[PDB]
Amino acid sequence: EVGVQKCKNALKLPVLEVLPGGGWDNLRNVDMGRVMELTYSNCRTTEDGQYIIPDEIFTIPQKQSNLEMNSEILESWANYQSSTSYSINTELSLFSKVNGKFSTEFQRMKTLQVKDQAITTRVQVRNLVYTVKINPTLELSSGFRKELLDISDRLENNQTRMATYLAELLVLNYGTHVTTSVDAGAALIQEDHLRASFLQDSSRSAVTASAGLAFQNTVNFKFEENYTSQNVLTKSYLSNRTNSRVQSIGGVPFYPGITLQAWQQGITNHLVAIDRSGLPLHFFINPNMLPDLPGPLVKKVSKTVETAVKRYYTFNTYPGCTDLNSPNFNFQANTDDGSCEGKMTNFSFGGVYQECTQLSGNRDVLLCQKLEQKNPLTGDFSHLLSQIHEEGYNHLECHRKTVCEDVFQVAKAEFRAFWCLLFGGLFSSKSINPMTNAQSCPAGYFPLRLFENLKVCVSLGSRFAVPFGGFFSCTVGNPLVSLKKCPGGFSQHPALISDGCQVSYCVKSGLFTGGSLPPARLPPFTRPPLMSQAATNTVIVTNSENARSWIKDSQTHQWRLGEPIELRRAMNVIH
Amino acid sequence: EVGVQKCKNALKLPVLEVLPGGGWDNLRNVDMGRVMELTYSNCRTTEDGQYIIPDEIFTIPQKQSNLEMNSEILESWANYQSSTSYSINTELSLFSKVNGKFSTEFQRMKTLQVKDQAITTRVQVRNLVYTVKINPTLELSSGFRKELLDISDRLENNQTRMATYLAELLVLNYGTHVTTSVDAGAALIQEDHLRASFLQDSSRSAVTASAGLAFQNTVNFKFEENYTSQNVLTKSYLSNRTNSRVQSIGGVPFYPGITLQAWQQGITNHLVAIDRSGLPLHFFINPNMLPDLPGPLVKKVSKTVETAVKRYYTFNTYPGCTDLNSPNFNFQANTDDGSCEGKMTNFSFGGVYQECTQLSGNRDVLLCQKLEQKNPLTGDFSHLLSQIHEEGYNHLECHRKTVCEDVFQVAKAEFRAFWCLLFGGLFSSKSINPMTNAQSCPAGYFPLRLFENLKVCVSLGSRFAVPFGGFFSCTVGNPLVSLKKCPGGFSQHPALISDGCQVSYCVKSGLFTGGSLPPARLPPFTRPPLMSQAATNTVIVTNSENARSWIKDSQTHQWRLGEPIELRRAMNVIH
Amino acid sequence: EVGVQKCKNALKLPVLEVLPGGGWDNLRNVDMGRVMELTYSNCRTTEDGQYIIPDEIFTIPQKQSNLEMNSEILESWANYQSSTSYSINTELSLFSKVNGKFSTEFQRMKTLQVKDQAITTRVQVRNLVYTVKINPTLELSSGFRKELLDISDRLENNQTRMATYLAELLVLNYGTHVTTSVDAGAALIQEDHLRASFLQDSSRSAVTASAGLAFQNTVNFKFEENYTSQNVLTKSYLSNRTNSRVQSIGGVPFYPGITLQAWQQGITNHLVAIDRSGLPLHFFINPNMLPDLPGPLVKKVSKTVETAVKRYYTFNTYPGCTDLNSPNFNFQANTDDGSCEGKMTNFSFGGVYQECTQLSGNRDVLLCQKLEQKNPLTGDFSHLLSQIHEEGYNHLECHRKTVCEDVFQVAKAEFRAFWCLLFGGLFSSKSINPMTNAQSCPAGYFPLRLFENLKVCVSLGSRFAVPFGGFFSCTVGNPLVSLKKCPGGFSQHPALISDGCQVSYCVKSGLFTGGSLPPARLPPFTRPPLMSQAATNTVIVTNSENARSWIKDSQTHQWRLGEPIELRRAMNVIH
Ligand SMILES: *[C@@H]1O[C@H](CO)[C@@H](O[C@@H]2O[C@H](CO)[C@@H](O)[C@H](O)[C@H]2NC(C)=O)[C@H](O)[C@H]1NC(C)=O
Ligand SMILES: *[C@@H]1O[C@H](CO)[C@@H](O[C@@H]2O[C@H](CO)[C@@H](O)[C@H](O)[C@H]2NC(C)=O)[C@H](O)[C@H]1NC(C)=O
Ligand SMILES: *[C@@H]1O[C@H](CO)[C@@H](O[C@@H]2O[C@H](CO)[C@@H](O)[C@H](O)[C@H]2NC(C)=O)[C@H](O)[C@H]1NC(C)=O
Ligand SMILES: *[C@@H]1O[C@H](CO)[C@@H](O)[C@H](O)[C@H]1NC(C)=O
Ligand SMILES: *[C@@H]1O[C@H](CO)[C@@H](O)[C@H](O)[C@H]1NC(C)=O
Ligand SMILES: *[C@@H]1O[C@H](CO)[C@@H](O)[C@H](O)[C@H]1NC(C)=O
């Protein structure tokens, strides 16, 4: 009797199930949580009277049905076209070559093209019924507004490591984009994979017309073979096809033999999104959407969320060779590198060493064990990055009467990795060693620990040997090519992202390259901080350019614009 | 019981779903938000008693059904005819060659004509049921009126950078035009693509009559082949066709085998817009639509919105070669240039350099790093534009008792780009480098940063080398052709629109040209300003020519016409 | 009238049976108990109005139907793809090669590939109807919250052995993961096993197209043979197939002859989970989910549960040879080792001996019997690990009047195992001796007890002799290869996990290898402790870095933030 069911009891007609305002992960092409609030307290319908819609949603009747007679030809996976989220992937961004490269649809097409040198053809029927958009005047959802205020509280109390962590949880829960418009409808798609040698034989206009005719035979005729696309060209066509599937998106489920008439009757009340557009997530963090906060404080929240989205694109970028016919083809690479024609020069190094340094003298945990490692061939330790490894421990003291008390300290320790035998190559915790596919070293190799969770397999051992190309990081390059990329003929691979620092290495294995595609490193990219910083309660927020000031009322009820008498009355206890 | 549902419960008949008064993007041909207010508080219907309409909408019964026997022939994509928004694209404007050039329908026709040298034919059935118009006496919507008052407030407080930003958000949300009349109906269209060599063979009257006959075979007969357009001419016709599709726009969804009788029965209650006319968005910003504002103040708001629409057309204009048979054909060019017959002269330059200058001496951010770059071949830095790069930072001081306070400053910095090796060529953030299609430099090339987010790949490296043609901007041309265009044989490409300043460059690659079509740079074209200006509260608005004056009542309730006693009583505290 | 049935009586429509928020065992791929709370006190439905859902669950309408024409080919069991829990097995973890390796589906595929050198093909129809996710703002279930507070109470009272035991009961009841999203739908799968020699014969595209055609003959046609996939290729295909099954997952039960039309009608109200994603179990133990506990205390609970999950993966990891064509293939090994090419060197040892040491002088139990064993060939006892064997006993004293009293002591005893004849080899309690498959020694062999429940069969006896490779443990390696792995040509086998210490041994039998697959060692891996430690009641919890403190109110009602007056008032009785 309140909200959705009040409309449904009064009107007796369904609710439109394709709605914008939700979050969107633009790498995986999945829907990620509700950013905007959608309330039903006006009983609004679409103007044809078919669907209940939210009060702040307007629809545009398209009623458009497209029917193709020819299949398209998609030449390569690098220029990927989604067919269900095409508008939001190809937006103007500095990340356009990574969008949609971790979706289930893309992983299947990249596998099938590389595995048996195939090109993909697509023919489809497409029904666009409504375009569904948000109004510009629109409020945030309560769950999304609450998680933005928590990032604001951690930035006031100078808890930057905690605020960066909560921003990466926001990207995990709400994605990178917010959909502002969705195309509601249904589609029926056939996707074939043909040998690339069959293409280059005048050719293309006769192939694609037969693929579109075979598609209409598959839908209209039953599984008993009564087709009409059987001629001389099809006997070669059926033998060069390496894979074939039919998918329905919306409507009734497809089976071979449903007519195109009957599939188009079941589209009603089964609409899904077949296209969508949107804006980045930090666009909707501005003083208009968050009115009960100071001005420059929400631009600091929006800058934190924007940095978290940009890390999510950078940690999932794989530069490398992309040209399939060339040697040193990198199958895990989603971005080209220019290293297709690469001359390889072998060069070795002695070993890799570490040292450990404790800022706090600890008699409890003894962090120096299993953190420092010396060279096997030099004997002692003889820079990549510079970071601090903290750990919390517990004291527990009593006094007999028995009551007790426990204090929690933070044991700090600091390590330094360095480079300047037999390989290998390496494996971290979260990765495996593709020399063994086993998170272990081969026979005759002992692991060298170079980080907190990374092992390097180093020693008859020449049967497993792979070359080497250097290390680099997000701040330090390598001189082997102060530049980030590998030398030519080498492929780069991530190894133990630590505190938001991507450190990589270069090899010439060929077995680190092949295998399954990497499944999309998700935030958070840092362990939760140990809360090593005290809450510094800010009371006055101001900026010098506007001479505007914000003072919140005790005890932390609401922010409020200031008055120059109330400023210096509060600046006396502040300064 | 209030508004729409009060009419529907009383009358028991649907609402007309094709309504004017909404916003319209004339580049992409999409509907963009509601500009006019449409209320239903009279229960008005169309005069045939079929549809509920708004109170300020009048309809004209057309009841017109057009049935073509011959296909048209559309000769080229430059003279594009939309078939669903033809009247509003071809209006009298200074932008007529860019209208509709980013719509989904145009992108498909330009691709299919260029890819296999095709000409497009179109045959259609078209039902115009109503012409639906707005009355001249009409009010603005509440959401659109609210966003115009926010532009008025930023212009009163001398916040010009914020008012320009809010005007570009108005174009993003509400488009460039407002539809004043829409043609409600349904259409059934077949679009073929034939080889251009098949056209020039007496010919045209026999081709188009067979295409119109094949269209009526496709609709009337089932997918089982029982057609009557099978003769000697069709066997050549079926072999020169490169693509074919059938689309329905409104009505029931099309399938091959629905009769033309049956398709025309399902048009009722499924009407869509098949044509529309309209006026520019700034036409509706005038003292009659906004009565509760001063006179010259709304002409300042209308001039701001008009400038924002004109930037949206200018940033999406691509001059270049258009003649398909000529060399140096620019596939990304939507506007002709006159550089079809172009003689190429090679000429090099040494390098490109920058200097940085801080207006504020900052001991916190140190903007000089990663902003200045020197020449690799000269050693030191030895003009395109002149703009200021600002950045906000945060101080945080405490006093132990612990309360705190944080001030936000604006760190200003100013850079200068300059021109007067091996290429290349370049890539910005939001663009990629089409030498690699990868947002990266080729092998042997290191990036030269020339802007805040732009890289220029400059060094065996002659295998990737492309020529060079110069730089120019919206204020500074180049002498290589003080003129804006490229020299002959070169194509221009945008690179890092910065603060509303289009700066471009010229190349002779051939790989920067090809690829997918650019997807329509959308507003805002500037980052949000850092609010570096104080609110100057204007109280009296007047003009010298009329001697009329407007004084708003404290505290900022409403504007009001003035009296000469109340002027000098308020001019005493003003001057 | 309260909860679930209140919704069902009002709405008269079923409840969605595929819900996230439950626990998940990622080794066995089974559902393990309810972690999150799901309440129905809003009568929420899916937006198509088909299913009642919980109030903190949102669904995404997918309505997606995939229909494959070609079977896949899965090359080996090491790269296992689950087809029903594929997303949660292949997550980014340091355990990725053990996930799903104890599920019923994997045990069948690994058996059928090894037994008759087979490769597996899979073809499937797959209907994804909804994606069902949890909101980020979500509370824990009452049963799961109660078992986390019990781990908190044992850590306050310094009862670490009891808290480690209750953490392993949490993994047994609630699994290792929590599902955050489930794909609701139905699938119809055919899985064949073909001879691997039939694969390598152009070949793969004709095999998989016939397997997909035979699948559609099996579903559509009745058991009376009327198939259409009968040609020259199938007569070889039917003879190289070693096993074949059809499974339905969701929907109506499959029988040969149900049409694909009829199977897709019965999917409604019979949805199951066909994919799922999730996060580790210790991710949901944080101060936001448990608000009524101190800060650093729940990070100690989360570290205890994380250690228990990591033991569950480590005790079920079997390194060894994996290459099927090589000798010394280890059938029980689920993780590769690099010991495929291994040269075997025979070397013997004299014997194994033990000594016992009692820390408490006991005149009641006499633990020295059946705990110490000497060498048969040396005569006396002449280190693996160092652990204490405790035992509780009972006194019972009376005084005639007759009332009584019984005290429970803890008899401590400590044993030491050592190494430095004829085999063998050994058997523990929970294992058997695969030389006899009988938990007994062969003829001519007497058992040598090396642990509390382990026997070693050591002596005409050369007919049962197997070689030897050494012992090692989780802290002590062996020098025969201070390294953990076996020497080459040897396989490792677990033997009597004792107090969380995996101690293993190496053999070259070939009969310890073969047999059935090991059925997934489940927690707890330790007997319950004898409660040998007094409750040390902590009252004040604090940490030095934040200077925050928590004081619970007498008598142990609730925790509460502290005040500096109440600290030293409570630190007086504490110190
Ligand atoms: C893959 O396609 C090629 C064509 O590019 C096929 O080769 C032709 O097959 C037809 C079939 O009878 C022959 O008549 C031609 O002589 C073949 N050669 C050429 C150059 O056209 C090839 O057969 C296809 N692959 C398979 C496995 O059939
Ligand atoms: C494309 O169109 C041309 C005509 O412009 C076709 O060429 C003719 O095809 C017919 C078909 O039998 C022949 O009888 C003529 O002799 C051809 N030449 C001329 C000059 O008319 C051409 O065949 C078409 N393309 C394809 C692939 O069929
Ligand atoms: C297993 O597969 C092999 C093919 O790899 C079969 O061998 C062929 O069988 C056909 C059947 O008539 C013969 O015509 C061929 O001459 C055989 N050899 C080759 C090299 O193709 C084998 O028969 C299959 N196993 C069984 C038991 O039938
Ligand atoms: C804020 O945190 C930073 C973190 O390093 C620290 O350096 C700084 O001193 C802190 N400032 C205050 C006022 O607490
Ligand atoms: C806590 O338990 C450990 C277990 O060995 C013991 O060593 C320690 O003395 C105990 N501390 C207190 C305060 O009871
Ligand atoms: C308990 O029973 C045992 C049984 O043999 C006996 O030896 C012992 O004396 C009894 N103790 C008491 C206190 O009754």
Residue numbers in the entry:
A (entry chain G), B (entry chain H), C (entry chain F): 11 to 211, 214 to 394, 403 to 421, 430 to 448, 460 to 498, 503 to 524, 536 to 629
Paper quotes:
Macrophage-expressed gene 1 (MPEG1, also termed Perforin-2) is one of the most ancient and highly conserved members of the membrane attack complex (MAC)/perforin-like (PF)/cholesterol-dependent cytolysin (MACPF/CDC) superfamily, with orthologous sequences identifiable throughout the metazoan. In contrast to other perforin-like proteins characterised to date, human MPEG1 is an integral type-1 transmembrane protein. The mature protein is comprised of three regions; an ectodomain located in the vesicular lumen, a transmembrane domain anchor that spans the vesicular membrane and, finally, a short cytosolic sequence. Each monomer of the 16-subunit ring possesses an N-terminal MACPF/CDC domain, a central multi-vesicular body of 12 kDa (MVB12)-associated β-prism (MABP) domain and a C-terminal region (termed the L-domain).
Indeed, our (ultimately unsuccessful) attempts to disrupt the interface between the double ring serendipitously led to our identifying the MPEG1 L425K mutation as yielding a greatly improved sample and an improvement in global resolution to 2.4 Å (workflow described in detail in the methods). This mutation resulted in two different MPEG1L425K assemblies, one of which involved domain swapping between the two head-to-head coordinated rings. In contrast to other MACPF/CDCs studied to date, the recombinant form of MPEG1 has pre-assembled into a soluble oligomer that exhibits the expected features of a prepore assembly. Within each subunit, both TMH-1 and -2 are folded as small helical bundles. A central feature of the assembly is a 64-stranded β-barrel that represents the top, preformed portion of the future pore. The majority of MACPF/CDC domain-mediated inter-subunit interactions are formed around the central lumen of the β-barrel. Around the outside of the assembly both the MABP domain and the L-domain also mediate extensive inter-subunit interactions. The L-domain forms substantial inter-subunit interactions in trans with an extraordinary elongated β-hairpin that extends from the MABP domain of the adjacent subunit (the MABP β-hairpin).
